[PDB]
Structure formats: C-alpha cells, structure tokens
Amino acid sequence: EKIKLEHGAGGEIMEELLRDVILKTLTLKSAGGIGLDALDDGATIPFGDKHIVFTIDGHTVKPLFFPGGDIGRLAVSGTVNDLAVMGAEPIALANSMIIGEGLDMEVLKRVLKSMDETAREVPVPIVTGDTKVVEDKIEMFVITAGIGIAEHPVSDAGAKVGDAVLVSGTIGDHGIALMSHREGIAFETELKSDVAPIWDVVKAVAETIGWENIHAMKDPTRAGLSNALNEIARKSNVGILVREADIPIRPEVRAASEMLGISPYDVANEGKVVMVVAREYAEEALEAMRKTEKGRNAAIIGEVIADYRGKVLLETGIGGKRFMEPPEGDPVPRIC
Amino acid sequence: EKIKLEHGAGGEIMEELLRDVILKTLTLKSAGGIGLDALDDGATIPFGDKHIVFTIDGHTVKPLFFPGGDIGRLAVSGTVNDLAVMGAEPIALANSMIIGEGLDMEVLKRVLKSMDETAREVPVPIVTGDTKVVEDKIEMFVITAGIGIAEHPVSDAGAKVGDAVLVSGTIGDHGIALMSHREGIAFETELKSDVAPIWDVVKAVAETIGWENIHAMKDPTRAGLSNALNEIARKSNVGILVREADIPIRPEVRAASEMLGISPYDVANEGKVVMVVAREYAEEALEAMRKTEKGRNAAIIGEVIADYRGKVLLETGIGGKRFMEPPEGDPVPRIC
Ligand SMILES: Nc1ncnc2c1ncn2[C@@H]1O[C@H](COP(=O)(O)O)[C@@H](O)[C@H]1O
Numbered sequence: 128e129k130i131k132l133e134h135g136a137g138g139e140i141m142e143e144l145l146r147d148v149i150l151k152t153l154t155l156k157s158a159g160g161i162g163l164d165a166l167d168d169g170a171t172i173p174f175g176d177k178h179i180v181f182t183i184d185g186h187t188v189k190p191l192f193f194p195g196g197d198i199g200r201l202a203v204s205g206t207v208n209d210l211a212v213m214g215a216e217p218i219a220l221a222n223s224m225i226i227g228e229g230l231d232m233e234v235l236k237r238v239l240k241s242m243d244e245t246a247r248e249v250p251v252p253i254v255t256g257d258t259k260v261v262e263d264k265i266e267m268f269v270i271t272a273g274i275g276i277a278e279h280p281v282s283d284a285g286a287k288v289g290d291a292v293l294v295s296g297t298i299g300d301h302g303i304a305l306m307s308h309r310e311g312i313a314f315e316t317e318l319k320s321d322v323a324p325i326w327d328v329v330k331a332v333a334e335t336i337g338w339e340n341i342h343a344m345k346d347p348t349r350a351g352l353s354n355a356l357n358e359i360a361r362k363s364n365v366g367i368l369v370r371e372a373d374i375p376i377r378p379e380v381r382a383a384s385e386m387l388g389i390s391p392y393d394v395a396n397e398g399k400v401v402m403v404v405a406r407e408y409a410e411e412a413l414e415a416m417r418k419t420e421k422g423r424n425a426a427i428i429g430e431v432i433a434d435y436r437g438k439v440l441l442e443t444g445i446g447g448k449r450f451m452e453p454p455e456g457d458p459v460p461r462i463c
Numbered sequence: 464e465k466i467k468l469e470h471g472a473g474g475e476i477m478e479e480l481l482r483d484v485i486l487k488t489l490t491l492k493s494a495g496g497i498g499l500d501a502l503d504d505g506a507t508i509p510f511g512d513k514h515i516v517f518t519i520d521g522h523t524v525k526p527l528f529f530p531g532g533d534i535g536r537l538a539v540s541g542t543v544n545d546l547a548v549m550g551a552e553p554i555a556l557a558n559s560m561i562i563g564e565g566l567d568m569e570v571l572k573r574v575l576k577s578m579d580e581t582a583r584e585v586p587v588p589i590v591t592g593d594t595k596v597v598e599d600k601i602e603m604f605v606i607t608a609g610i611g612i613a614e615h616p617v618s619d620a621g622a623k624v625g626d627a628v629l630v631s632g633t634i635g636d637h638g639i640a641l642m643s644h645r646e647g648i649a650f651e652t653e654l655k656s657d658v659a660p661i662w663d664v665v666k667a668v669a670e671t672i673g674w675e676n677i678h679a680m681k682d683p684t685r686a687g688l689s690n691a692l693n694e695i696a697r698k699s700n701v702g703i704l705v706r707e708a709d710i711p712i713r714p715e716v717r718a719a720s721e722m723l724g725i726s727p728y729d730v731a732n733e734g735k736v737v738m739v740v741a742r743e744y745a746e747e748a749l750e751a752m753r754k755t756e757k758g759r760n761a762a763i764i765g766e767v768i769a770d771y772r773g774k775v776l777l778e779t780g781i782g783g784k785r786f787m788e789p790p791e792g793d794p795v796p797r798i799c
C-alpha cells in the first residue's frame with residue numbers, strides 16, 4: 128500500500144489514515160486535556176485556572192503567491208485560526224521553513240514580509256523557528272506551530288440539539304480563487320482568496336454571548352464547509368440541518384465554481400469560522416460577527432437536530448432535503 | 464542572490480541569513496521573555512510563576528533510517544533536547560509530516576513507531592499534528608514543535624568568568640555515523656548515531672546543583688560542538704578555553720573522521736548537551752551526569768575566561784593554544 132495525495136486532502140481518506148494508522152501507532156496522545164484522539168483543531172493542556180492550546184500546520188501551497196495572499200499569510204492565518212476555533216487567544220507562533228536550494232532571496236524576503244504584516248494584524252509574535260535548505264525542487268514549505276491561552280476551550284464535539292449553526296462569511300473563496308487562477312478564469316479582477324486571521328471575529332462573539340454559549344467551532348479549511356459540518360455532526364452525535372439558500376456565496380465564486388465543475392462547499396476556506404451557539408444567543412452572535420470587518424457577511428445557516436445523528440442535511444426549495452456528503456478529499460490539489 | 468545549502472547548515476552562513484534577513488524583516492519577535500532576537504534554542508513566555516518554553520525543528524535527514532536511529536527518533540529527540548537546554552520539562556509535542564506521494568505505508572508506520580517509542584522514553588505525549596502529501600519526490604520531512612515548562616529558564620548567554628564547561632558525552636557520533644554509513648565505512652559493527660532525548664541528563668544536574676548554578680546550555684546539533692561553544696562565547700561575551708585532550712571522542716569516531724577528513728567537533732550531535740556551570744558545582748554536575756546512562760561519558764572540558772571575549776581556544780600538548788573556529792556550516796549534507 129502506498130501513500131496517495133488523497134491521504135493529505137483533509138477528507139474521508141485522510142480520516143481513515145488518521146484513525147487506522149496514526150492514532151493506532153502513537154500511544155501517548157494527551158497532556159491532560161483535549162488530545163490527539165479527539166482529532167480537533169488543536170490540543171489543550173490545563174495550566175492554572177486556564178488552558179494552553181497548541182496547534183501545528185504545514186503549508187505546501189502552489190504557487191507561493193496567489194490572488195489575495197501567499198504562503199506566508201496562509202501560514203500565519205491558518206495557525207491563528209486553529210487557535211481561535213479552540214477558543215484561544217494567540218500568544219506566540221513558531222516558524223519552520225524548508226527551502227529548495229536556488230530559491231531567489233527576494234522570494235524569501237517577500238514571504239517573511241507577508242508573515243510579518245499578517246502577524247501584526249492579530250497581533251501575535253513569531254518567537255522561534257527553524258530553517259532547512261534541501262536539494263529537492265520544492266521552492267518552499269512553511270510549517271507554523273501556535274500557542275494560545277483559552278479560559279474556556281471550545282471543542283468540535285459540543286454541539287447540542289436546538290443550537291444555531293453560523294458561518295462568519297462567504298464560502299468557497301480560497302479554494303475557488305486558487306483553482307480559478309490556475310485555469311485563467313477571472314472577471315473584472317481576479318477572484319481573491321479570503322486568507323486572513325479571524326481571532327477578532329471569534330473574540331467578538333465570546334465578548335457578546337460568553338464562551339459557555341459557543342458550543343462548537345471548526346476551521347473549515349481542507350475539504351471545506353461540508354467536511355467541517357460533517358465532523359461537528361459526527362463528533363457531537365447530532366444531526367445538522369442547513370438551508371442552502373442561507374449559505375453566503377460570492378456571486379463570482381458561484382460562477383467560477385460552475386465553470387470549474389466543483390462545489391464551493393467542498394473546497395478550503397482560509398478566513399472563515401463555522402460556529403455553533405446556544406439557540407437563544409444566535410441573533411446576538413450573528414450581530415457581533417457582522418459588526419466586524421472580517422465577519423461582515425456572516426449568516427445563520429442552520430440548526431442542530433436530534434435525528435440523522437452524524438449527518439448533515441441540506442434544505443432547498445420549499446422544504447425538500449438531501450444529504451451534504453463529506454468529501455473524500457479536497458478536490459483542489461496543493462490548495463494549502 | 465540565491466538560497467544555498469549553506470544557509471540551512473547551522474553555521475556562520477546561516478547566522479548571516481538570520482541576522483540580515485529574518486530578524487530584520489520580522490517585527491513582532493517576543494511574547495514577553497526570550498524571543499527571536501536572542502536566537503536561542505527556544506523562546507520563553509512568562510506564565511504565572513513559571514515560564515512556557517516553545518521550540519520548533521524541521522527534519523530532512525536522508526536516508527530516513529540510519530544506524531542508531533531514524534527521522535522519527537530524531538524528530539522527537541531534537542525537540543525534547545531543545546526544550547531541555549532551555550531548562551524546560553517537556554509537556555507536549557506537535558507533529559507535522561510532509562510526505563511524498565507514493566511512499567510505502569510501511570515506511571510511515573515504522574517512522575511513527577519510532578516516534579512513539581522515543582516519546583515514551585521521556586515520557587512526553589504527541590498531542591496534535593498535521594499531514595500533507597506532495598507530488599515532489601521527497602520521501603518524508605518531519606517537523607516537530609514542543610512546549611515545556613521551566614521554573615528557571617537557561618539561556619545560551621549566561622556564561623560567567625570562572626565557570627566550568629561540560630559536555631554530557633562523546634562528540635561527533637551522529638554526524639560521523641551518518642557520513643560513515645554513506646561512505647561504507649564500518650568496523651566490527653556500523654557506527655551508531657547517538658540520537659536520544661536527554662532531558663533526564665539535564666534534570667539530573669538541576670536536581671543536584673539547582674537551576675541557578677547552570678548558567679548556560681546549548682544543544683550542539685548543526686555545525687557541532689565548535690558552533691555551540693562559539694555561540695555561547697559570543698552571546699555571553701566571554702572567552703572559552705577548552706583542553707582538547709579532555710573532549711571525549713569515541714575511538715571509532717576518531718578513526719572514521721580521519722578517513723573522512725572531517726573534524727568531529729564540526730558535525731551534528733543528536734544526544735548531547737553542552738553545559739556551563741558555577742565553578743564550585745562543576746564536580747557535582749559531572750557526577751550527576753555520569754550517574755545517568757545517557758551522560759555516562761560526560762566530561763569537564765574547559766572553563767570560561769575573561770579575555771578572548773567571543774572566542775574559543777583549544778589547548779593542546781603541555782599548554783599550547785589555538786582558536787577553535789566556528790564552522791561556515793555543517794560539512795555533512797542532509798545530516799538532520
Ligand atoms: N501526522 C500527524 N500526526 C499527528 N496528528 C495528526 C497528523 N496529521 C493530522 N493530525 C491530527 O488530525 C486532525 C486533522 O488534521 P488537520 O488536517 O491538521 O486538521 C488534527 O486533530 C491533527 O492534530
């Protein structure tokens with residue numbers, strides 16, 4: 128048996144590798160809180176009356192620079208966002224770079240400048256790192272780890288019947304922008320990735336409704352909104368019912384996805400959060416998001432239900448329903 | 464200007480890249496304690512009456528499996544050792560893997576099993592991670608980040624005049640074993656790498672003499688003992704005088720290094736610590752190390768002096784001296 132691209136594509140095939148190989152081989156997997164077996168956006172460690180949150184993400188996107196961002200902005204944003212969806216204020220990043228021999232020094236400078244600018248938006252410092260140079264023709268991979276502090280960690284398994292399901296903005300932007308750029312599809316301007324740190328959106332909600340009323344979150348990166356909703360449903364052992372008409376999609380992203388023959392629900396987002404909140408605070412949560420710049424297009428898209436446990440239903444027309452199936456993997460190669 | 468292999472070789476050429484490009488481009492570099500500008504083995508963050516210590520290391524060693532270890536054992540050991548030389552008890556690791564499409568699943572299983580076994584020696588859990596699969600023919604890169612807790616962080620800049628300089632064991636084992644394996648040099652058995660987690664050696668000393676009497680430590684990985692001593696001298700603004708005869712070198716490593724035409728002082732070690740301790744506790748520190756299995760061959764090799772600030776002197780014969788020059792880089796390609 129050989130490793131396939133699908134094993135790193137963030138969908139069901141990767142999930143099989145994680146459960147059958149990684150989780151079964153590693154034995155020490157928790158430091159006292161959320162650990163590897165939870166397969167959440169990060170891990171947690173009790174520390175005093177708070178929790179340290181710990182995450183890591185590798186980035187192998189091609190091309191390194193794309194409309195709306197680059198591998199540097201992606202590296203900072205992805206790690207900040209993984210901490211944010213665990214309920215953690217980011218406190219430090221670590222930056223590993225693996226660089227192909229012969230890369231232009233100016234490329235490395237541009238990547239670092241983008242990391243710096245993106246980190247300053249949070250704000251969060253890059254406090255340690257590592258650099259390796261290899262003969263392989265890879266251009267550059269960037270791997271960032273993050274530490275945050277959470278007073279009240281939020282899992283992807285805490286959804287309750289009756290809760291509202293929100294997204295902080297338009298869906299499909301990153302994956303579709305990257306595929307569109309590769310295919311030469313563009314409108315009045317090129318479609319831009321949404322890549323950005325969204326700790327401010329999560330914090331805004333928590334400051335309004337309290338951490339206890341945010342029941343679950345996921346960062347809908349690899350394999351998209353569909354993967355994220357399916358994971359929350361499965362891990363929380365609940366059903367999720369979403370109204371297709373209420374899911375925000377940028378008009379240009381809708382058009383490009385049709386041309387590409389790919390669903391915007393199935394591709395990576397890099398500046399969005401999926402959030403599940405107590406029914407009675409759903410409108411307060413939505414208003415808090417829409418007050419921020421990065422959450423300006425937020426919407427309530429669904430609700431958690433008692434039946435169809437572990438499944439996600441899409442409602443269309445005047446009430447008809449079908450399953451929103453978990454992707455086998457992200458249909459976009461080298462997307463992040 | 465292009466990125467060269469030397470830029471990742473852990474010596475003076477890498478130091479130039481760090482100071483002229485990375486440190487000058489990144490602006491947010493500290494979370495309140497030791498930060499990026501210190502260029503130490505890790506960073507520190509005040510937390511209550513203790514300090515969180517944070518480190519990251521990428522591993523691109525070839526071949527993946529070598530005498531005495533593999534990339535999995537290297538990934539766990541290197542990160543644990545970086546935390547240990549900051550004075551930190553390891554509490555959690557994060558595991559990023561980037562895998563070449565087509566790698567045998569059995570190779571991935573073997574690597575993970577080695578990580579598991581090595582982590583269990585510490586003991587320290589692997590609590591989060593990431594997997595990417597790329598088309599590039601890289602086999603596998605492993606990037607690990609670590610979190611530890613230190614009551615009293617130890618810098619590489621705290622050496623004082625009169626202090627003793629110790630190493631926890633034989634010097635040059637890893638780099639020379641890897642080069643010997645590539646060249647087909649072997650004795651009754653193949654030379655083994657020393658790769659191993661050495662938190663127990665550091666802890667043993669601290670439990671004996673107290674953290675306050677350990678003034679500096681470095682993990683002598685890339686560019687070897689020579690690089691580590693030069694960095695401590697330069698950052699502490701002191702001279703270091705070492706007696707060549709007192710530096711422990713395995714007889715087989717000495718022989719192989721001669722055949723290879725490479726100094727054992729200039730190549731990576733993966734199971735060793737360089738430690739600088741208060742003069743009056745040097746013998747207690749040495750005894751504490753030699754009581755452990757991994758520190759069994761520890762030696763006092765030198766002392767910190769007031770002149771030749773920023774330099775390292777090697778004493779030979781009956782008193783003659785020359786400089787131990789900082790390497791331009793590790794003379795071993797793809798060593799870690
Ligand atoms: N190579 C790996 N080692 C350990 N844990 C992993 C690895 N790859 C993924 N994970 C975990 O699997 C889940 C999904 O990974 P990600 O694709 O980073 O969201 C997260 O909980 C990760 O911590």
Ligand SMILES: Nc1ncnc2c1ncn2[C@@H]1O[C@H](COP(=O)(O)O)[C@@H](O)[C@H]1O
Nearest residue numbers: 222224255256257258481485502503504
């Ligand atoms: N790409 C990078 N980004 C940020 N810091 C780095 C990078 N590479 C190395 N460093 C820092 O430079 C020092 C030496 O790196 P290392 O070779 O990992 O010992 C350490 O303090 C690292 O944290």
Ligand SMILES: [Mg+2]
Nearest residue numbers: 168209346348
């Ligand atoms: Mg995530």
Ligand SMILES: [Mg+2]
Nearest residue numbers: 504545682684
């Ligand atoms: Mg180090």
